[PDB]
């Protein structure tokens, strides 16, 4: 079974949302998870997750700790293989400029990932955490925050987030 039916459906969706599907992307991420999971519990302890990011992306350990918390919505103290696979997919060669356009497109939720609270409104702290993950100037983040915050409630709702992403994507394509 193509690494399970759900992964194959995600791969078709990834091919649709990515100009280059690439070769065995899912298998490579699964192999990396297997190497970390010598125990094969199907979950990764914090040390394994932190070390892999340090080994490949050379990320700050404190930044990796924030990333671990966002990925571990279950908060069981371990990272599931799907969460680890999604996190590598989220970076997707983060250094490359082309990835930033794909990162702006995000995924089918397109707002849920930014909204850690899940209240349908994104807090300023959540945006700051995203800025640590994706490099953006603090003044630039404030300017984007003001443009989206027409209400003045300092919260981003889903429809506004979708429109804000669409406007930036259209400008980037232009």
């Amino acid at each position: 079974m193509k690494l399970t039916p759900g992964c194959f459906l995600w791969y078709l969706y990834m091919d649709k949302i990515y100009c280059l599907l690439s070769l065995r992307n899912v298998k490579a991420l699964m192999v990396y998870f297997h190497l970390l999971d010598v125990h094969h519990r199907n979950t990764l302890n914090d040390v394994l997750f932190f070390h892999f990011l340090q080994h490949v992306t050379n990320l700050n350990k404190s930044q990796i700790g924030m990333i671990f918390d966002l990925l571990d919505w279950t908060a069981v103290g371990e990272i599931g293989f799907d969460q680890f696979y999604v996190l590598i997919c989220i970076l997707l060669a983060h250094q490359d400029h082309l990835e930033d356009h794909f990162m702006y497109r995000h995924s089918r939720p397109v707002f849920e990932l930014l909204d850690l609270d899940g209240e349908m409104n994104i807090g300023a702290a959540n945006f700051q955490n995203y800025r640590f993950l994706f490099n953006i100037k603090k003044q630039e983040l404030r300017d984007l925050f003001h443009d989206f915050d027409i209400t003045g409630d300092r919260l981003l709702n889903y429809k506004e987030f979708k429109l804000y992403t669409i406007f930036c994507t259209d400008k980037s394509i232009d």
Binding site: I150, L163, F167, D170, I173
Partner: protein, 32 residues
Amino acid sequence: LERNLAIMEEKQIILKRQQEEVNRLMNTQKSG
């Protein structure tokens, strides 16, 4: 009200750009 006017102008400009982009895409599709 002034803030309302600005927001509606920005929304109309968004709609204008969307229509322009779709029109250019249709032109490229037909001519290609």
